[PDB]
Design a protein around this ligand. Sequence first.
Ligand SMILES: Cc1cc2nc3c(=O)[nH]c(=O)nc-3n(C[C@H](O)[C@H](O)[C@H](O)COP(=O)(O)OP(=O)(O)OC[C@H]3O[C@@H](n4cnc5c(N)ncnc54)[C@H](O)[C@@H]3O)c2cc1C
Length: 272
Amino acid sequence: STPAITLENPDIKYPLRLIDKEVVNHDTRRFRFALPSPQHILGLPVGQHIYLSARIDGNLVIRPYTPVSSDDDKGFVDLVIKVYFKDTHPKFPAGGKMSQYLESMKIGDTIEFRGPNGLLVYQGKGKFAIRPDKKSSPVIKTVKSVGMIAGGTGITPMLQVIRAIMKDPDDHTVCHLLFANQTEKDILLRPELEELRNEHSARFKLWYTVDRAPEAWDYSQGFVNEEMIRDHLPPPEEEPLVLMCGPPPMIQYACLPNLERVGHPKERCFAF
Ligand SMILES: Cc1cc2nc3c(=O)[nH]c(=O)nc-3n(C[C@H](O)[C@H](O)[C@H](O)COP(=O)(O)OP(=O)(O)OC[C@H]3O[C@@H](n4cnc5c(N)ncnc54)[C@H](O)[C@@H]3O)c2cc1C
């Protein structure tokens, strides 16, 4: 038999109860929400995400999240969240709406989840099903390697796919991640990524870039560029699938132009 799923219908909102909040570091949290019973699973295909929705300061706010849990977890869903506090970044004085709302929640408060959503589903052993849109059907793309470019919060769609691959010992797909952040301090999920590298280096390649680097830095500095894509993603000759998730100036200026310069087919590069 299979566990009961939580996300039965994508147009229903499921208010889930907050049961634990971990302060990972000053501005990073892990929020654990209870599913309807301890024996439920979320019901989120690999490749897809959920949305959170709430009335925040009187207005509707909806945002996508990819849990760090999986359908192997019974009874709960975990979200890792970067909190964007007001009065910290000069270009974003108000901070972030949903992330500050999450930070304000009390244990026992609920928030609405909906899903699953997204045009890409990983079907295992290198096979991806990618819709060109929500009523069109998908392209069952099969690849030997996956190039992944994440910026900031865009890591969690990548991590979900990486973990699904690594846990299947008969999945020979190789994932190459290039992960960009503002600073070293601002990197999400570094221990988790480095554990995967420790255990699965043959199938998981890891590289970081930071906009500004610390004194002691072993990786790259600057925005994603042509050289980083040549050096840290599979070559286009091997026809990898290229996945991206990051702030829309990152995708537009740093990722797509440079993927094209290396020779990857731009129009095949998928943005979560
Ligand atoms: C598929 C997918 C999965 C995602 N998964 C996650 C996840 O697991 N965890 C997660 O935390 N986010 C995730 N995100 C990002 C998420 O959807 C929101 O963009 C994020 O929570 C910020 O929303 P907000 O309402 O707090 O900010 P908004 O009010 O929408 O602010 C807009 C933008 O302003 C920038 N900004 C605001 N304040 C600051 C600040 N102090 N410093 C730097 N930049 C600032 C940010 O880039 C922010 O996105 C995901 C996005 C996608 C597309």
